[PDB]
Every structure is written in C-alpha cells, then in structure tokens.
Amino acid sequence: MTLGDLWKRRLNNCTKEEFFAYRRTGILETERDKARELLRKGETNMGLAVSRGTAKLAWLEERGYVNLKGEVVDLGCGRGGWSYYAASRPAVMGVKAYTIGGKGHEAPKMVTSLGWNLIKFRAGMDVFTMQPHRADTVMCDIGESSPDAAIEGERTRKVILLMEQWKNRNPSASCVFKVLAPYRPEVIEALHRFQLQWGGGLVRTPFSRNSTHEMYYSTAISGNIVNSVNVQSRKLLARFGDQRGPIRVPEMDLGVGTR
C-alpha cells in the first residue's frame, strides 16, 4: 500500500462538508460566473474558456512543460477546453478532437473561440478502439474519478496504453496526458516503461483539486516518477485539515475569430 492509497482512504472518510473544504483548499480556481451563464444561454461568440481544463493546459504550456504544435489530436475532448486552447496557439495547424459523449458525458461546446475553424470535432467516438493516425502532438485528458482506487488505476492504465499506441504510430510526437491515479502499482509500471522508451515525466498543476491525485505526464519534462508521485501524495495528505479557501483567478479568454 502507498501513500496515495492512504490519501484515497482518508478522502473517502471525509464528511460532505470536510470534502468540500478539502477539495478547494489552497488551489487556484478560475472565476467562471460570466462564462457559465454565457454557455447556459447558448452564446456562441465567446472566447472565455468552455471548461476548467483550458487554464490547466495553458499553465502547462506557459511553464514550458508541453509543446503544442502542428497537427494536434485531443483524445477525450469533452466540452473542448484543451481543443480550443490548442487551436488558439499559432504553432498549431489543426486539431482533431474526439469524445464519446452519451449519457452522463460532456459533448463539445460549440463557440467561436480563436481558431475554432481549425478544430474537427467527432463526438460518439471511443478513442480506446480507434486506430491512431499521424499527429505531431497527442493530448489526452481522460480519467473519470471513482471512490474505488483500483478502478481509477485501471482507467489510468488504459490511458497509458492508448498513449503507447499513438506513440507507436507517431514515435516523434509530443505527448501530454492525464494520469488519474499515479500511485497505483500497474500505473507506476506502465509509466516507467513509457518513460524508458519516450522520456518525459510528471507534474502537478495548481488548478487540480485536492480531491484528485491527477498528475500530467509530458514528454517535454523529466524526473523520477516514484519520487514525483510520493511528493504529491505527501502534500495531499498534509492538506487534510486545512481550512483556507481557494485562490480565485480570472478565467482565460482566448478571444474569438478564425485562423
């Protein structure tokens, strides 16, 4: 058993109020009041982020931890926060975005955020059975939370396998992907094998809630995986009991228009 496994057990033992206070304490949170109502009313001429994912990917890019360029694939795009972010980057030439949709899952939000015309959305697509194709940058933000850490480990393992399949097709592609449960043993093993062949490492974004252990793997960084994970587990465990709130920051606005 790992520190991350203990984190999960402590998290599941929180009351609803303890959980609400814990998940937000000390995290950066974009202010989505305006964005939420625009989307609800169906305004399509907006460049405000369609989801909380845009600022996470922007932080990775702005830190230099990811390289977004060329033909981009967004595997599991949901509302499209990463696809709209990528499409606004001048180095990006096109985005092919795929998501399953269906009951209980987010369909792409349709807006004129800068570069929207360079995105091809396909909803109703399962990426785990879809043949890879050529790409310069592969992105995947898949990983559904569950109270069962073993289920989260298996979901994470499937994402890493998908990445391996896209790297087999595109050995030179940049990769950035969510690792939902990085402390599980089959995840550590798969990440070690991925790093052995492709390089890369893990990083925690400051927008991730304390109620998720998610870390982002990118081929553009480095670092010992086990140490990266354990440092993060210890940080999450120490935050139980903290009552400070989140740090509110403005939401990203990419502007509107075609590229």
Ligand SMILES: C[S@@+](CC[C@H](N)C(=O)[O-])C[C@H]1O[C@@H](n2cnc3c(N)ncnc32)[C@H](O)[C@@H]1O
């Ligand atoms: C909520 S998103 C990540 C958020 C996104 N990066 C953003 O910025 O808006 C992950 C998405 O992957 C989708 N998904 C999960 N499994 C999938 C699969 N096997 N094939 C395609 N999409 C999947 C989920 O429905 C979910 O919408």
